[PDB]
Amino acid sequence: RRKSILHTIRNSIASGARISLGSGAARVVNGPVSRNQDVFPILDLQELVICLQSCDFALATQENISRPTSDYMVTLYKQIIENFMGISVESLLNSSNQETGDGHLQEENENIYLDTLNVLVLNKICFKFFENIGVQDFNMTDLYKPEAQRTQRLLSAVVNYARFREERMFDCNSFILQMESLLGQINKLNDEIKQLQKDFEVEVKEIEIEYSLLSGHINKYMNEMLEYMQ
Amino acid sequence: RDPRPLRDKNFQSAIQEEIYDYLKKNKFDIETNHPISIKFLKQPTQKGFIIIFKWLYLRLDPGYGFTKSIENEIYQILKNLRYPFLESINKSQISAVGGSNWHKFLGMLHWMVRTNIKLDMCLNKVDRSLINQNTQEITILSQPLKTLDEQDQRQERYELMVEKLLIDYFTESYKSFLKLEDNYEPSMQELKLGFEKFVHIINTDVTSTELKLEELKVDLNRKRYKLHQQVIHVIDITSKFKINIQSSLENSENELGNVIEELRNLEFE
């Protein structure tokens, strides 16, 4: 994918936005222990929607968070996971589905299971992603029976993670710059080598054209002569 | 529809043995103190049915916490799981599991056990897939072959590799951030090792390319030497041909002029 959160943040640094909008990080401590909500904001709409769209997530719209429905959060979650975590959900499901492992008598109609398993795998993927962002509470309901509270909670954790990425970006350029240096060096070497080889072969072809047509012309006029005179 | 021959008792015996084996192999009896035996599967209680359904679905979706009214949630779970035989089962029957329609309930429990086993297999498959398609990039990037629109693909692969490293760093760092201790040195040194290996690979590639360009320069000079020799030879032969043809034409023209003049002298008479 041509996009990411890292390169987009760099491009934003180069622009006048500064750090791609937002207020850096958030870490809520909690001693309500009679209650317990994990360490991240539940920052509300607008702030949430603005941050989501700042990360180049066009599907983010206020009408979805406060009134979510199935098949909408699914696309957004796939998009977020593939951007931050740099994977392909479709490739993973395809890998799970493939065959030449099991083989079994009553499994000649695995279709009745197949669909369900894909669902589960999707869900479980999200689980781990959200298990890495302070929430242990993804379950099926978030995907297929969404409610605004859990949606805003998960998205708040997500935006907090994104802001953390932005903050810690400075430790990364020491590597991005060297990567780009080496890649640009390779590209320049390849361009030079291609130019040299193309130049030589074009010169050879042009000379061949010259001399072939020279031979043709000499034969042309010699034979045109000798046909009239003999 | 439900093609399963649920009412057959040999089929039921097989299903009950499989369910018992799965629950024992995964310690249902220990995690929940309610024990399980095949006789129970033949003569189920309502509470034991609820416990088994809960245990199975939580093995299938740990993040879910029960709520509501289990009659209202079992249907919704099956609806979200798109249980293909959902339309064949009525919700009210959930109230009395051990009654007339116990066969469908035992059938869905077998469905869930099979789904659990297959889910575990799928997760192992995807984990191995991740570890393998991580190493596919490096193994591809250390083979010499091809040049077709792919050098761009090579740079893309390098970028993706480094991006993976960075994502690992960020995820671990955010783990430390949420766990309010802030020790980023371990994440940093793991990132440093990864990027060092990246640098070694890409610099090996760069050195290969530099040597290849130098060898190309040598070869092109050697070939242009021969090209120059051939061009000089062709020009030489062309000039010799031009002078010879010009001389032959001049001689023919002069002799024909002489003959024509002599013929004029002869005709005047």
Numbering used by the authors:
A (entry chain B): 254 to 270, 290 to 305, 1002 to 1153, 1407 to 1451
B (entry chain A): 114 to 318, 621 to 684
Sentences from the paper on this structure:
The bridge between centromere-associated kinetochore assemblies and spindle microtubules is the Ndc80 complex (Ndc80c), a heterotetramer, conserved from yeast to mammals, with globular elements at both ends of an approximately 600 Å long, largely α-helical coiled-coil shaft. Closely paired calponin homology (CH) domains of Ndc80 and Nuf2 at one end, augmented by a flexible, N-terminal extension of Ndc80, form a microtubule-attachment module. The coiled-coil shaft of Ndc80 : Nuf2 has two specializations—a kink or hinge at about 160 Å from the globular end and a so-called ‘loop’ at about 240 Å. At least three interactions involve subunits of the DASH/Dam1 complex (Dam1c, consisting of Ask1, Dad1, Dad2, Dad3, Dad4, Dam1, Duo1, Hsk3, Spc19 and Spc34), which coordinates end-on attachment of multiple Ndc80c rods around the splayed plus end of a kinetochore microtubule.
The predicted structure of the docked segment suggested that a fusion construct of part of the Dam1 C terminus (residues 252–305) with the Nuf2 N terminus, combined with a deletion of residues between the two conserved stretches (residues 271–289), might ensure high local concentration and increase the likelihood of obtaining informative crystals. We therefore made the inferred Ndc80 : Dam1-Nuf2 fusion construct as part of the dwarf-Ndc80c, expressed and purified the recombinant protein, and obtained crystals in space group P3212 (a = b = 130.0 Å, c = 216.3 Å). The Spc24-Scp25 component had dissociated during crystallization, and only the Ndc80 : Dam1-Nuf2 heterodimer was present in the crystals. Dam1 binds Ndc80 : Nuf2 with an α-helical segment, which rests in a cleft between the coiled-coil and the globular head domains, and an extended segment, which runs along the N terminus of Nuf2, but also contacts Ndc80. A salt bridge between Dam1 Arg299 and Ndc80 Asp295, both conserved across budding yeasts, anchors the C-terminal extended segment of the Dam1 fragment. The Dam1 sequence in the structure also includes three serines (residues 257, 265 and 292), the first and third conserved among budding yeasts and the second largely so, that are potential Ipl1 targets for regulating Ndc80c binding. The structure suggests that phosphorylation of serines 257 and 265 would substantially weaken the contact. The side chain of Ser257 is close to conserved Ndc80 glutamate 276 and its phosphorylation would result in electrostatic repulsion. We observed that density for the Dam1 segment fused to the second copy of the Ndc80 : Nuf2 head in the asymmetric unit was much weaker than the first, and its appearance was of insufficient clarity to build a molecular model. Thus, the crystal packing prevented uniform ordering of the Dam1 segment at position 2.
